[PDB]
Amino acid sequence: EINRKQAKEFYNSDMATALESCQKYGHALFMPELIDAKILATKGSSLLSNWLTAPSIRATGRTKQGNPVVVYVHVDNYLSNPENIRNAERINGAGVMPVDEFQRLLDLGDNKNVFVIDYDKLKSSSSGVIPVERALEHPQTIPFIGGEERAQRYLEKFKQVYGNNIGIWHCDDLKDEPLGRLLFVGDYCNNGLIGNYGIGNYARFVGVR
Ligand SMILES: [Mg+2]
Ligand SMILES: [Mg+2]
């Protein structure tokens, strides 16, 4: 398994330990490259049969003007540092982030590396399995995966590998603090785009050297 360079997978029941191993080796792929890597992979690959974790996050908080928003982050952030995964406060599984950090990510909102979307828009959307047909119009799909092209790309692969219904999952993380969760992409068992999973526990990263 090489992704142009040598690529090892990094599992642990302690997320911080897994990420730390991954970062000692090389660097962990964020969700866009994680997704692509799967698209490049052929039937039989552990990339297709194991669920996977990315240091990408889904964060919920307030803009300076105090509007609730959800942002999907595919760059280095507070929760892609293992020491923070260990030590930050957790509220229903989500890690607490500094207001400064959440606002720094808000300002990086292009629609390419960081996607900001409206809280009510996600909260009114489904959390669960839906036909691939309806996937792309779901508020999570495109920011989650990182681009409309890439998302339609993966949905293609998805129909071929996992089938005709996809899991798009999320929960309500609007609380008195900014809250982040690392993103998971499922397998045959755990199906789809998983953004309601708690931090600190099971994780499987992909590192490249
Ligand atoms: Mg632990
Ligand atoms: Mg805080």
Numbering used by the authors: 2 to 210
The study reports:
Diversity-generating retroelements (DGRs) create massive sequence variation (1012-20) in select proteins. The archaeal DGRs have in common the genetic elements identified in bacterial DGRs. This includes a variable region (VR) that is located within the coding region of a variable protein, a template region (TR) that is similar (~90 % typically) but not identical to the VR and located in a proximal noncoding region, and a reverse transcriptase (RT). Thus, a hallmark of DGRs is the substitution of adenines in the TR by other bases in the VR, resulting in protein coding variation. The results presented here on one of these, AvpA, revealed a remarkable conservation in archaea of the CLec-fold for accommodation of massive sequence variation.
